[PDB]
Symmetry: D2
Subunit: 417 residues, 4 copies
Amino acid sequence: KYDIKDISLAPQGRQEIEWAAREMPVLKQIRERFAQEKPFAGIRLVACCHVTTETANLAIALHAGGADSLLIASNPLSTQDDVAACLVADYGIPVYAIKGEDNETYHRHVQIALDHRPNIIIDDGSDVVATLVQERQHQLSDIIGTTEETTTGIVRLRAMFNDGVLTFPAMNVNDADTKHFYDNRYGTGQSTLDGIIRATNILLAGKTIVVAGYGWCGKGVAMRAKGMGADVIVTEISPVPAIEAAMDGFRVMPMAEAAHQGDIFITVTGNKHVIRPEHFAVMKDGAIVCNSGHFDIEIDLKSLKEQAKEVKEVRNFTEQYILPNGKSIIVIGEGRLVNLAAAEGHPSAVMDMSFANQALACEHLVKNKGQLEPGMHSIPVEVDQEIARLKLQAMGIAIDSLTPEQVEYINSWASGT
Amino acid sequence: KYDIKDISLAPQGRQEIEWAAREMPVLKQIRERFAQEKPFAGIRLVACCHVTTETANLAIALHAGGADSLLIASNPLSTQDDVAACLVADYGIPVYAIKGEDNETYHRHVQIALDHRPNIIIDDGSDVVATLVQERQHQLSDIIGTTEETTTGIVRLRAMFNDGVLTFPAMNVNDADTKHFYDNRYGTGQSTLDGIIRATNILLAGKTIVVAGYGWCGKGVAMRAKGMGADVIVTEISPVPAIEAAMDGFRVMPMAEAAHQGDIFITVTGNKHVIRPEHFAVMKDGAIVCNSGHFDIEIDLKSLKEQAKEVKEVRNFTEQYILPNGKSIIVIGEGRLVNLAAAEGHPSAVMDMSFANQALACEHLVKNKGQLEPGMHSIPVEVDQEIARLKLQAMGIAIDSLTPEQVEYINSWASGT
Amino acid sequence: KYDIKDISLAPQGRQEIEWAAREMPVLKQIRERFAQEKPFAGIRLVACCHVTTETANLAIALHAGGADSLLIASNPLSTQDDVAACLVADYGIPVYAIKGEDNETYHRHVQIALDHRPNIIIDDGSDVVATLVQERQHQLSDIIGTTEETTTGIVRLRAMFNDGVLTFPAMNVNDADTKHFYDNRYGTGQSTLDGIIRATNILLAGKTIVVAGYGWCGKGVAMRAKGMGADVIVTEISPVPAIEAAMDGFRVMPMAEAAHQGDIFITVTGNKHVIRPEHFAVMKDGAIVCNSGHFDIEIDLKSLKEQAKEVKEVRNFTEQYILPNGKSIIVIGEGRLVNLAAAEGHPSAVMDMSFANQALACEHLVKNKGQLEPGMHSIPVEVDQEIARLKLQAMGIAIDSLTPEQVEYINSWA
Amino acid sequence: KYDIKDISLAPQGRQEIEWAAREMPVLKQIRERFAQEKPFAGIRLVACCHVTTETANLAIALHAGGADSLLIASNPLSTQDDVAACLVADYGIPVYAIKGEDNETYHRHVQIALDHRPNIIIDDGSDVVATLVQERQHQLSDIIGTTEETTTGIVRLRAMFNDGVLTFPAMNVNDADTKHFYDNRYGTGQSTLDGIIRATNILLAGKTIVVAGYGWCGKGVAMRAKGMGADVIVTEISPVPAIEAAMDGFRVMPMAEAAHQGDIFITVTGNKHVIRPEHFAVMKDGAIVCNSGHFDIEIDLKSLKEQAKEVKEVRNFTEQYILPNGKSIIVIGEGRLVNLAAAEGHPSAVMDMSFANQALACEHLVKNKGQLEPGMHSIPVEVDQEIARLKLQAMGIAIDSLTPEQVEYINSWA
Ligand SMILES: NC(=O)c1ccc[n+]([C@@H]2O[C@H](COP(=O)([O-])OP(=O)(O)OC[C@H]3O[C@@H](n4cnc5c(N)ncnc54)[C@H](O)[C@@H]3O)[C@@H](O)[C@H]2O)c1
Ligand SMILES: NC(=O)c1ccc[n+]([C@@H]2O[C@H](COP(=O)([O-])OP(=O)(O)OC[C@H]3O[C@@H](n4cnc5c(N)ncnc54)[C@H](O)[C@@H]3O)[C@@H](O)[C@H]2O)c1
Ligand SMILES: NC(=O)c1ccc[n+]([C@@H]2O[C@H](COP(=O)([O-])OP(=O)(O)OC[C@H]3O[C@@H](n4cnc5c(N)ncnc54)[C@H](O)[C@@H]3O)[C@@H](O)[C@H]2O)c1
Ligand SMILES: NC(=O)c1ccc[n+]([C@@H]2O[C@H](COP(=O)([O-])OP(=O)(O)OC[C@H]3O[C@@H](n4cnc5c(N)ncnc54)[C@H](O)[C@@H]3O)[C@@H](O)[C@H]2O)c1
Ligand SMILES: Nc1ncnc2c1ncn2[C@@H]1O[C@H](CO)[C@@H](O)[C@H]1O
Ligand SMILES: Nc1ncnc2c1ncn2[C@@H]1O[C@H](CO)[C@@H](O)[C@H]1O
Ligand SMILES: Nc1ncnc2c1ncn2[C@@H]1O[C@H](CO)[C@@H](O)[C@H]1O
Ligand SMILES: Nc1ncnc2c1ncn2[C@@H]1O[C@H](CO)[C@@H](O)[C@H]1O
Ligand SMILES: [Cl-]
Ligand SMILES: [Cl-]
Ligand SMILES: [Cl-]
Ligand SMILES: [Cl-]
Ligand SMILES: [Rb+]
Ligand SMILES: [Rb+]
Ligand SMILES: [Rb+]
Ligand SMILES: [Rb+]
Ligand SMILES: [Rb+]
Ligand SMILES: [Rb+]
Ligand SMILES: [Rb+]
Ligand SMILES: [Rb+]
């Protein structure tokens, strides 16, 4: 069984997946080894991911390794229906994912996924792992381990750990060097603006753009907003990233001060209610708000809907809320990750490395079953470094190597004058 | 006793030190607390640092804390003679440092410094700590601990540790967030180009600039070279920084390929012989080479002097080597850190944080004497974070703070859908 | 009446036109003056433009001015069918424009437009004016004047003038300060990369991108490619813009040297066959070629078709040509204007100033009928400056004004 | 004979002049043609320029051309004393220029220069030409023509023309493509920040920097300030450059709003009193003000002096004004050209093209004696283009050339 929009989209989905593969050579090399070695023979796997052409290439690599996989959507609005159709029709992979599905459907998919009795859970935001631990304690004996794709899910796993309920190994994929140094920064930077421009066709040049958060994602978004000619305001809660943002040329201020000035607001904090009613109240007429953090809770949309006297779709992915004072607030993507909701997410070039990490993390869990302590686990350095070497080579870039004389110099300490 | 160029420069040096203090408010606040609390009462201290207006403000803060300090130069060419005169004449601090001193003099200063029988050694490159361990094993009982300012010295300390001879605590100042995130990146970026432009008055726009190394320093130099209109080539030995440099818009290649194309070469690798005779051989006529890593050994200057049939000073800090084929290679600063040799080093704004870390690391060593294991020690997070908070405040920048509702959200794991 | 795809798209086109109008405040003010003063009463007008939400707002303003207008597509791939439906159904403006129309349909539409016997012709690339001068010498008595939107069209008019056949006033809209300083530069800079990304979802960071031409468009394309993390090569034929590109941090080289290195090629020259058979042969496997200058002839696609053993459609707006050695060349938008073929063209903020220039140029032609010398006329300085003043004000930006003593000091020399 | 600081500096000045010549290949080629053709034989010439290693290379080229030249300083703070020594001692060129000379010495030098009875005057800011027109109406019969190096001077000449006293040809060197596209933009962009950093060693990253003016100089200053990590505010009086600055990512606002926010203020307007008493009163404690336009009058330093209770010299080229409330305002270079007062002026790469224009303009004036209309003359296009071609070639950059079919296609319109 499966639950998708339209099985007839599989031929289009097959073509989209092959296009995306053009820039996933590291994952393709992993798939080919998996086809030989079958690391997941006999393993049941659940993946809660954005159902995109990039996720399909990861699902196909796990299929080649022998995994009995079931895929559900990580977000109601990021699903690519033609991809879902292709995975069902061409690979026989159960997919429960419909673009635009409601909340009841999403939760029912999570339940169907746990009924698959997975041994490995690939999660993106930790919804499925949190549901497992809260509602399916009786299933924990099935678990070899889990993996977590994104920053928000890592925070949830720490909270699970500190609550004493992370009773199995969980691979921190997000914090691998070849994941958040490129995916979170360069990918979010391009695809966030992609989603905004597809939604609105607004000229970014000459606009004031407010980026909440200056971590890996915020650095990318601010960098690319600036590259497209915007005046960039950064907000923060920590002084180290705040100083960095100033020395990168951006204006740093509290959100209450930014709210008067922004034309476009982008949240990338991983936090709740970063943009609040006290902020909507002072925004310019026609201000655009959107979110590129994992959950929409970064913008208090519930309060906006309550205050507004009217909402209407004015363009694809674009809603205009009209406030009782007659001013309007424009929301893109209903507050969901704008790159995936209004565009196609990150280019496959960065997802190659992110999903290479996912594939090898799953292999790590199986090859080390019964030898990993419960709790969080970093990607092994050798694996992280090998992904980077292979990606650099596939990009056609050559670099230098240390000579034996340089190796000797590093190990020396008496010399230097 | 002391060993300086000219005591009569103290009035000029006093004015230079006060100017530099305009942007060192975090260190000034530390000095004022030190004046009250006298943490270094009865402590003998040796500092091997670049004798600059920034180092003077740190020396004055240690003096206010009661330290019996002696200062020697970290590099023969970075000394500011008027600063040396002021510290001797106005504070009575022994300074052994002459701009342009030869190697015999430098080594004799190191010996005089160890004869001071220090309890704390502040080192910049680890020369004095390596000399202590190799030649003064009988003095180790004096040592409360040491600190290390820069990346090259950290590498030496690891080699000492792995050789089993790091038998005392050593504070890793360089790797504090408020040190290498700003000093190594934003400071080196501006002051490296400062030194090059003061030496030559070359238009950087339209030149090809080759940056060897894409760590904290290389990121800054490349960023600012690009900001000044240069075509930037990056060389590397590791794939993670190499990919970053490409996604930042720079051309990544092996040095053998870069050597044909560069107009200006800047080494910031911390490594030996990054630019070798096989590279000089193919450089454009008039190519400029310089170094911003701690030691000049990054450029094989010994071989260049041997091949050249002639050398002459053509401008301040600027030497033209003429090769037997009649082509010329231009060397700035005799291969020594070009920012300090041809200009004035980093602006005091970043050295405020670097030397705030130095001052509190020394206080940490004394307040925890007899409770630190031998080996390397990171700056405590609370200290690192407090420097950043105080610097952000002194820069006049305000940011947000987490509400209790957001704190609750972070500690929650069942919520998120 | 009209020739369009589906009139049932009119309500969607209306919503799209209204969305675009949000950032066309200057043209809005012009439309409202036009509806009162009716400067185009009794005037027939043909517009040959990209049939976009921005052109619609222009057509709506001319219609408010009394103009009996007829619109045809400047390019078969840039037409927005919902916009064509809205203009016909909501405004009664005849539109001859179907997205994807073939060449015969295009040329038929141009003949239908000339049968309107226009007094004013707004052109984009000069196709209709050249046809008029060539085939309809008897209709020149109708012509009060024409306008030309784009750089390629200005060059063709210059050739028309030098040939001695430019026997009427033509307003050079493209060279207005408030046109090519912004439209050609910032407009093309964003919308060109927009089209590439919508076609391919390729990561620009880390790629070598080759920009042919460093005029207004190339400056904009190179600036935004750099801002998205790309390594930028520029090619040129003139030394002055070539030195600018180097001092802007870009590599400058002949296209034959760049052909071995680029991952993405963008032509913005206005000239013919800038990317040539001998470049395709040495390109990297999977290199992308696209064009942002007015006509697709910037790329020698005919040669690529005969060099390739196979061509497949692999993504929207994207063709993969496979050469006998198995290497691929990717073409976006069949070589037509990549911003308008694979995306939506310039954001309406810049089209506000370009189309304010069109509207006031048409007013200029009518208010000066029988008084203008034949040939090309630049936009009047006061018109151009007042557009900039209205736009800056609409952007919410305030600037300074000289004091009486500062004005005095300018006019002193002692 | 001459009036200089110390002739014993000649050998050091020679080494400095030779170093600068390395990146003046175009002027080198001109000098070598001049030494053969001797276009200035029997011609007397006055040059009022910044006495730098770059101006020396110009003077050396004119001397090779047979010119009987006399050089005086354009600005008391920009003079390089070793260069003045080398020109006198090694070339026998009379130089009247001492770094730090007072106002009376400057005006005396200008009178000495006019007593040379020059046939050609090379000016920078138009001080000597205006004095000639004002006080030496009897000497106009000597004048074959003059040249003007900088934007401020072109404005003064326009006022001279409109007043009716520009009774001779003046070559507009500043507006040559190969002059203000590079000198004014990339030259001032680097050398202005160079002067600030040499004066203060302040970190630019993290600072708000206010650039008054977004012409060629302001574009360059803003571009490089941004590249060094600064938050850039731009002020303007014209909407067209104001919209450019916004679309370049900069904040645009009136100077009175910027005065509360800037850490560093840079004036590049050519106008009088752009930073005013009411701005000083609201500036942040320790704000830095400096000027990069030709004259120091861009900043109302007289008002600052009367608002301050105290002034101290705290660094080279740096004054600290302390206001009654204890807040400080920092002035660099006494408000004179910060790049030339606190550093060395433009790198010689761009002065190569500016001074190639000077040299060929002087040749133009002499080769066209008695044939030129009175008034201002632009640099001839072929001169300007050939300078760009020689410079690009000297930079080692190769570009493309149109093929015969591409030339054909330009000239077709059908
Ligand atoms: N849309 C995408 O494709 C995509 C990709 C990767 C990650 N993400 C998501 O983006 C979010 C950010 O991830 P990251 O890797 O940048 O995290 P990060 O830990 O590197 O950075 C988050 C930053 O936000 C700051 N911050 C926290 N609360 C804030 C507040 N109230 N106001 C302002 N700043 C605040 C923190 O100080 C920190 O610097 C997460 O939800 C992550 O899951 C999205
Ligand atoms: N001049 C200054 O004021 C200043 C300031 C801080 C540090 N430094 C010095 O600069 C140097 C670099 O410090 P950092 O903090 O950037 O170190 P880092 O560890 O952050 O980076 C060094 C980088 O160089 C690369 N590398 C090593 N050998 C290489 C080689 N042969 N070719 C190319 N790349 C190579 C490494 O892969 C790494 O990415 C050190 O000597 C440090 O002491 C100088
Ligand atoms: N797609 C769009 O939305 C859009 C917008 C505006 C203009 N355009 C088109 O873009 C083209 C260029 O317009 P522009 O305003 O930048 O023109 P321009 O005259 O300002 O600049 C064109 C540049 O191309 C250079 N060039 C010419 N032939 C060349 C060749 N063979 N190789 C390399 N460089 C060459 C020229 O020297 C010049 O610098 C025109 O066809 C114009 O109609 C398109
Ligand atoms: N220091 C140097 O080496 C150097 C080099 C070249 C030119 N200059 C000088 O720089 C100045 C400017 O030259 P340019 O070529 O950029 O001139 P420009 O004519 O191209 O630009 C000047 C700009 O300043 C603006 N402006 C005028 N008054 C203003 C005011 N009160 N407030 C704000 N903006 C105002 C104008 O609108 C214009 O955009 C001149 O004095 C020129 O002589 C100095
Ligand atoms: N194209 C994509 N396909 C799948 N996952 C994606 C894509 N773009 C972004 N993501 C992932 O979504 C996560 C946020 O939910 C990020 O960690 C990122 O890796
Ligand atoms: N102005 C300066 N004064 C003192 N030390 C400096 C200065 N500029 C750079 N340094 C230091 O020199 C070290 C390299 O030897 C760097 O770690 C850096 O912190
Ligand atoms: N959205 C758009 N609507 C109409 N014309 C456009 C649009 N984007 C670009 N153009 C115009 O198309 C011309 C190229 O033929 C450019 O001169 C430009 O003004
Ligand atoms: N190094 C220099 N030598 C001579 N003139 C210079 C130099 N730097 C800038 N200038 C000139 O000074 C003028 C300003 O008066 C500018 O037009 C510029 O051409
Ligand atoms: Cl592998
Ligand atoms: Cl403290
Ligand atoms: Cl109007
Ligand atoms: Cl010549
Ligand atoms: Rb896709
Ligand atoms: Rb409501
Ligand atoms: Rb060593
Ligand atoms: Rb100093
Ligand atoms: Rb030798
Ligand atoms: Rb949570
Ligand atoms: Rb549109
Ligand atoms: Rb010089």
